[PDB]
Amino acid sequence: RKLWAPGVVAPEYLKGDLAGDYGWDPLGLGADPTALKWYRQSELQHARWAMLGVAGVLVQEIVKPDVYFYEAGLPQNLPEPFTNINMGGLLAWEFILMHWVEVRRWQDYKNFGSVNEDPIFKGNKVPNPEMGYPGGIFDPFGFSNLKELQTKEIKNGRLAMIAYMAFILQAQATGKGPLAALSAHLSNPFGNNILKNIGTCTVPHSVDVQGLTIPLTCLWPGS
Amino acid sequence: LPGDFGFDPLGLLDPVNSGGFIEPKWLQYSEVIHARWAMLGAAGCIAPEVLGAAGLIPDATNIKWFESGVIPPAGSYNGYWADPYTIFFVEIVAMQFAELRRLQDFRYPGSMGQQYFLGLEAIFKGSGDAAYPGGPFFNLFNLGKTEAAMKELKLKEIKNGRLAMLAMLGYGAQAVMTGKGPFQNLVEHLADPVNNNILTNF
Amino acid sequence: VRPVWFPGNPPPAHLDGSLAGDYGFDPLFLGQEPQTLKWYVQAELVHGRFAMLGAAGIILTSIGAKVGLGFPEWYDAGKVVVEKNNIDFPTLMVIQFYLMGWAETKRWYDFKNPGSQADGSFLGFTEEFKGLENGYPGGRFFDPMGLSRGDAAKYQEYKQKEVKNGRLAMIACLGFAAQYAATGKGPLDNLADHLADPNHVNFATNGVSIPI
Amino acid sequence: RPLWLPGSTPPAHLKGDLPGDFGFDPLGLGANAESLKWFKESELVHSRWAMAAVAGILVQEIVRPDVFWYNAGKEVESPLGPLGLLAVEFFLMHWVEVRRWQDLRKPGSVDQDPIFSQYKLPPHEVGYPGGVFAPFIPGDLAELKVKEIKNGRLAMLAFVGFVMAAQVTGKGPIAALQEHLADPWGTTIFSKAAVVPGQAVAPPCKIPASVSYKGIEIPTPCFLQGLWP
C-alpha cells in the first residue's frame, strides 16, 4: 500500500483505512477524531459537488455551444419557458429546500443513523452503514469491492474538484470556454497559452441585476 | 557545529562566562537565520532583471530592485492593487505572528504546540532545537535519510547561506557605486573584462 | 492550561481562573491584593455594562439616521433635543444627579458592608436588597427572570459571555469615538464608505491615523 | 415522546408533565419553580387572548368588510361616550383581573360567590377554573388542554402575521391572501425587498402617520419601520 512519495512515512492515523488514504497531511489536521470525521464529511461534500458541477458545465457547453456558462447566471440568459422569473420567489423556494435537507444530513452527523426512518411514512427507513452513506433508496441499483468502490469515488472526485477550479480560472482569464480554449491551443499550442493570457482577467466588474449591481470579482489583480 | 573551519580569529564562541546574547546557541541561530534570508534576498534581487532581459515578462515590471517602492527617493513603482502602506500594515501583522511564535518556541522549548491553535500545534512541536524543528512541514520530505547525509546537507546549507550574504553585500555596493543593475554590471564586465571594471568605474 | 492571552507565558500569582475571563492578563500586577482585585472586578463589570448600553444606543440611532427618519447623529442628539423641547440644562442635570447618587451610594455601602442593605431599613424590603456576589446583586428584582437561581453551570457560562461582550463593547465605543473625531462623520457612514472601497477608504488613506 | 427537534435531547427541568410540552427551552428559562408556574399561567392567558382576537378579526373582516379592522379604533362610532366605554371597561376588567391575581397569589382562597354563598366554585388548579366555567365538555381534559395550547400558540403567530402584513400592505389579510394566490412569485417579501452590501431596500409603510380623532390627533408610528427588510 503506497504512500504519496517514494521515501516518505505516513502519519499514524492516515493508516490506509479511509478510501484514498495516501497518508498525506503535511499540515497535521487529522489529529482530533471528531474534527477528522467532520472534515471527511465535508470532503465527500466537495468531491460529489465538484463532480456535479463539471458534469453540468461540460454538458451544457456541449449541447448549447453558445452559453458561456460563466454567464449562465443571466436573469435574461434563461431558457424560453421560464426565462425572466422573479429572483425573489426563485431564491425563496431554493433556500427553503436546501435549509431543510442540509439540516437533515447535519442531524445525521450529530447522531449517526438517528433519522433513518421517514418521519411521516415511518414504514420507510434508510439503512445507512457509515457516516455519509445513506444507501438503500439512495442507491437504487444497490451495487454495494465496496472498498475499491469508495476509493474510485474519492479519486475521481478530487480530479473533479481540481478540474472545475481550473475551468473557472481559464474562464476568468481568457473569457473563453473549455472547449474553446482547447481548440485554440489546437490552433497553436505556442499561442493560446496562459503565458500570453495572464496578467489580465475578463471580469465585467459588478454587473447590475434587476434590482442592483452585485459586486463581482477577479481571483487576483490581473485586470 | 556545521561548517566550522576552526576560524574564529576574534574568538567569541568561547562558551565560558557567557550570558546575555553572546551565547553559542543564540549566535549560531542568528547565523542560520541570516543565511536563509540572504539566500532568498539574493534570488529576489536578481530575478526580474534577467527575467525581463530574456523578455519573458512585460517590460512594465522588471524595474531595478531598489525602485519597487522600498525607497521612494530611489524611485517608486505603482500598479500594485493597493497602497504601499496598506500592504505594509498586513505585512506588520503577519510577521508579528510568525516571528513572535518562533521566539516563544525558542524561549520556552516545546511550549508552542499546546494552546489550542486550530490543530496547528502538532507541527509547531518540532525538535527541541531552534532553526531545526523539522516536523511534518518544516521537513516536508523525510530528508536526512542517512544522518551522514543530514550533516552533509547542513554543511551545504551554511555554505550557500554565507555565499548569499556575500552576494547580497555585492549587490548593495555595486548598485550604490555604479548605480546600474546587477545583471547590468554583469553584461558590462562581460563586454569588457578590462574596460568594464571598478578601475574603469573610478 | 487555560488559554493564556500570551500563548506560552504562564499566568502570574493572583490570576488564577476562578473569575470569568481569566486569560491571565494583568502584566502590571494591578491585582495582587484581593481587596483591590475584587474592587477592579466590580469596576470592570459596571464599565462593560455601560459600554454595552452605549454601543446599542449609538448604533440604533445611527441606523435611524441613515434611514430617512430624522434621527440626529449621536454627538448632537443632546443639544438638538434639548433645544427642540422646553428642557432646562440645570433641572435635568440636578434630577439626574439626585437619582444616580441615591442608587449608586446604596451600591457603595453594600460593597462596604456586604449585607446591610436588605436589613429592612428600606421601606419593608429584604431578600432583594441583599447581594449575591461581589457585583452580582441578583435578587427578585435585579434578576427577576430568575436565571441566577438555576443551573449554576449555565449561570457561569452567562457570566463568561457577559464579560466577553462587555470588553468588546468597551473597545467598540472607543472605536466610534476615534472614527468620528477623525473622519468628522457618521460611524455607519464611514462603514459604508470603507465598504465602497476597502482598498482606499481606510485609515491608511485617512491621512491622520498614519501621519505620513 | 415527541420533541420539537426529533433526535435531540430535552433539558433537565423540562420533563413532560405539562400539557403540550415538547422540551422547547433552549435557554433553560424554566429553571425555577415559581417562575415556571408564572410563565405557564401567562402563556395560557396569552394563548386564549390571541385565539379570541384572531377569530374576531377574521369574522369581522368577512362580515363587515371595507371597515379596516386595524382602523376600527378611529372608524368606530357609538352613541355612548368614549370616556364612558373606557371607564366601564377599566373598572370591571380591573375587577376580574385582580380577582384572578388574588387567586394565583393565594390559591383556592376566593372560590366562593361572596354574595351568593350558596354558589361556590369547586377547588382546582391554576389556569383551570372549571365548574360553571366548564359546563359542557365533549371528550377528555388531557387532549383538550393540548388543543388549547396548540391553537393558542398558532393564534399568536397568526395575529403577529396579520400585524406585519397590515404594516406592509395595509390590506385585510383575506384580500392580501387573494393577492398572494393571484401572484405566486411577486407577493413575497423576497420579491418586495432585500439587503445586499450594495444597498438596502424596504417596502414603504402603509399606515400614513398620526391620525386625528376628536382633537387628540393620535401619533401613530410604525413598529420599528427602520429594520423592516
Keywords:
part of a larger assembly, 4 chains, C: about 210 residues, mainly alpha, 5 helices, about 0% strand, D: about 230 residues, two-stranded antiparallel ribbon, 2 strands, photosynthesis, membrane supercomplex, light harvesting
What is the number of E strands of chain C?
0
Number of helices of chain C: 5
Largest interface: A-D, 19 and 16 residues
The helix-strand sequence of chain C is: HHHHH
Binding site for chlorophyll a 20 (chain C): 209
Binding site for chlorophyll a 4 (chain C): 39, 47
Binding site for chlorophyll a 18 (chain C): 194, 202
Binding site for chlorophyll b 1 (chain C): 5, 49
Could you please describe the fold and organization of this structure?
This is part of a larger assembly, with chains A (223 residues), B (202 residues), C (212 residues) and D (229 residues). Chain B has 202 residues and is mostly helical. Chain B has one domain (1-202). Chain B is built from six helices and no strands. In chain B, helix 1 (24-53) packs across helix 5 (147-177). Helix content of chain C is 52%, strand content 0%. In chain C, helix 1 crosses helix 4. The two termini of chain C are 43 Å apart. Chain D is globular and about 65 Å long. Chain D has helices spanning 33-63, 72-75, 82-105, 141-169, 173-182, 189-192; strands at 194-196, 199-201. Helices cover 45% and strands 3% of the residues of chain D. Chains in contact: A-B, A-D, B-C, C-D. Chains A and B meet through loops of A and loops of B.
Which SSEs are present, and which pair or pack?
The structure is cut from a larger assembly and holds chains A (223 residues), B (202 residues), C (212 residues) and D (229 residues).
Chain B: H1 24-53, H2 84-107, H3 122-125, H4 135-138, H5 147-177, H6 182-191
Chain C: H1 34-66, H2 74-84, H3 89-112, H4 152-183, H5 187-196
Chain D: H1 33-63, H2 72-75, H3 82-105, H4 141-169, H5 173-182, H6 189-192, E1 194-196, E2 199-201
Binding site for chlorophyll a 14 (chain A): 99, 104
Binding site for chlorophyll a 3 (chain A): 22-24, 40, 43, 158
Binding site for chlorophyll a 30 (chain A): 185, 193
